[PDB]
Structure 1
Amino acid sequence: PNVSRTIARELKSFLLEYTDETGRSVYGARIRTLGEMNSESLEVNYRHLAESKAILALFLAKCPEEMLKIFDLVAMEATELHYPDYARIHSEIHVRISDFPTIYSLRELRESNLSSLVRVTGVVTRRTGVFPQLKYVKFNCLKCGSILGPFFQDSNEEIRISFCTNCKSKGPFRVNGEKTVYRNYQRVTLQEAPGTVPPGRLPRHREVILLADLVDVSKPGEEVEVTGIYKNNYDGNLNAKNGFPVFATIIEANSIKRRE
């Protein structure tokens, strides 16, 4: 919406003017721990935000796919008043929302938990290698120039952005290997913990995507606690099943905690 500019100025006071326990604002002493580890990750608790403003706590569970972009874009200009020469080191920060107790073990996932912040524990089974992703679709149009401006296909979607009327008509486009920003990628599946199984039933799998900071944080055999989101991945969802329009569901991860 266009109400976002009212949101940008009014959560910025909860990065600077939120203090607790006789001074030492915990998100003024947090950005100084960025830089000296140089790690583009702000830790943000959920209890430290929900007690102040109950409006934005609702707007995390409603639609965090458009909420976290604005919560990242102003997160740059919080550091910029501390480290003014930080445009050239990753130029980007994404955020690390803490505990929100929604789902108990694994199997409470209905329609009513779609596209919402879910927290879930489990056990890592197996994991693939580390690969690069595109993140910046840059065309190879023959009629226009081969720089053509930055366009975004950054999802599990693989957008069908056709090149029509580029310079004089629809120029045929491909992808090159030039000047785009790749990022990491690693799929790791996860199954149910053997301590909290109901009697008789087999454990269930689920696929989890990690992205761009949290690769090589797992090891097979760990009690991992994922706080991702929950979406509806297309691109080959039961290709031999068109009489049953049945969609594939992948958790995109937003944080990883170890056993506690």
Structure 2
Amino acid sequence: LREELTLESLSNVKANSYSEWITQPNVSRTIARELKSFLLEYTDETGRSVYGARIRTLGEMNSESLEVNYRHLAESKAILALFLAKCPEEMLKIFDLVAMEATELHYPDYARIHSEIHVRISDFPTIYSLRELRESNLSSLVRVTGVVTRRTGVFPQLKYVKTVYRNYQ
């Protein structure tokens, strides 16, 4: 509960699978602290912290999506990049809940503008066409290219199963 792990302690996956290791409370709190420490601290060679500048422009446009480059996350705290590649569906939940703290540090009461922020990953370093996908790729993050053949109209969709909705296509 109270105690936290070191980053070196996370080098050894101790449970029988990745997802059952990320979801534990102490491990999750350690990952949240390390991601917040990464987001507040990464720099260009000129100093000039890029993500502080991006959070600044997030409110200037009243936007909803923060963008994170994968190469930056791999350049330091590499194990988090590995976990993200293996278990995106959990890692992005934790990352979004950190990103909201980072944005509220700039703009208090930004929750009144938007209630939730999504992290967008960029420059994932491996690519497939639609040939190479196999069953081993299931639940893993992938990067794909092609031509969009057909598009539906936009609809609302029930978010939770008092009610809330989201767009869908």
Q: Give 1:2 shift.
A: 3.7
- Quote the Cα distance in structure 2 between the aligned partners of 1:127 and 1:105: 20
- Quote the Cα distance in structure 1 between the aligned partners of 2:75 and 2:140: 20
Q: Give 1:104 shift.
A: 2.9
Query: 1:85 aligned to 2:112?
Result: no
Query: 1:73 aligned to 2:97?
Result: yes
Name structure 2 gaps, 5 residues minimum: 1-24
- Quote the Cα distance in structure 2 between the aligned partners of 1:259 and 1:25: 34
More helix by share: 2
User: 1:15–1:27: 8 Å Cα contact kept in structure 2?
Assistant: yes
**When the two structures are superposed, what TM-score results if normalisation uses the length of structure 2?**
0.80
- Quote the Cα distance in structure 2 between the aligned partners of 1:35 and 1:41: 10
**When the two structures are superposed, what TM-score results if normalisation uses the length of structure 1?**
0.53
User: How many residues in Structure 1 have an aligned counterpart in Structure 2?
Assistant: 144
Query: 1:182 aligned to 2:91?
Result: no
- Quote the Cα distance in structure 2 between the aligned partners of 1:117 and 1:95: 14
Name structure 1 gaps, 5 residues minimum: 137-178, 184-257
The CA deviation string for residues 91-135 of structure 1, in whole angstroms up to 9 with x for no partner, is 100111012233332211111111011000000011110000001
Q: Give 1:39 shift.
A: 1.1
Query: 1:35 aligned to 2:18?
Result: no
The CA deviation string for residues 54-111 of structure 1, in whole angstroms up to 9 with x for no partner, is 1011101111111110011111000111100111112100111012233332211111
Q: What does residue 259 of structure 1 align with? A: 168
- Quote the Cα distance in structure 1 between the aligned partners of 2:126 and 2:168: 18
- Quote the Cα distance in structure 2 between the aligned partners of 1:259 and 1:64: 21
- Quote the Cα distance in structure 1 between the aligned partners of 2:105 and 2:155: 35
User: 2:155–2:168: 8 Å Cα contact kept in structure 1?
Assistant: no
Q: Give 1:9 shift.
A: 1.0
- Quote the Cα distance in structure 2 between the aligned partners of 1:259 and 1:101: 28
User: 1:135–1:182: 8 Å Cα contact kept in structure 2?
Assistant: yes
Moved over 4 A (4+): none
Deviates more, 1:103-112 or 1:52-61: 103-112
Q: Give 1:10 shift.
A: 1.1
The CA deviation string for residues 8-35 of structure 1, in whole angstroms up to 9 with x for no partner, is 1111121111111211100000101111
Report sequence identity in percent. 98
User: 1:99–1:119: 8 Å Cα contact kept in structure 2?
Assistant: no
Q: What does residue 70 of structure 2 align with? A: 46
User: 2:154–2:168: 8 Å Cα contact kept in structure 1?
Assistant: no
The CA deviation string for residues 200-246 of structure 1, in whole angstroms up to 9 with x for no partner, is xxxxxxxxxxxxxxxxxxxxxxxxxxxxxxxxxxxxxxxxxxxxxxx
- Quote the Cα distance in structure 2 between the aligned partners of 1:27 and 1:111: 36
Q: Say if 1:134 and 1:259 are closer, same or farther in 2 by CA, change over 3 A.
A: closer
The CA deviation string for residues 133-184 of structure 1, in whole angstroms up to 9 with x for no partner, is 0012xxxxxxxxxxxxxxxxxxxxxxxxxxxxxxxxxxxxxxxxxx41100x
- Quote the Cα distance in structure 1 between the aligned partners of 2:114 and 2:64: 7
- Quote the Cα distance in structure 2 between the aligned partners of 1:67 and 1:21: 28
Q: Give 1:40 shift.
A: 1.1
Q: Give 1:259 shift.
A: 23
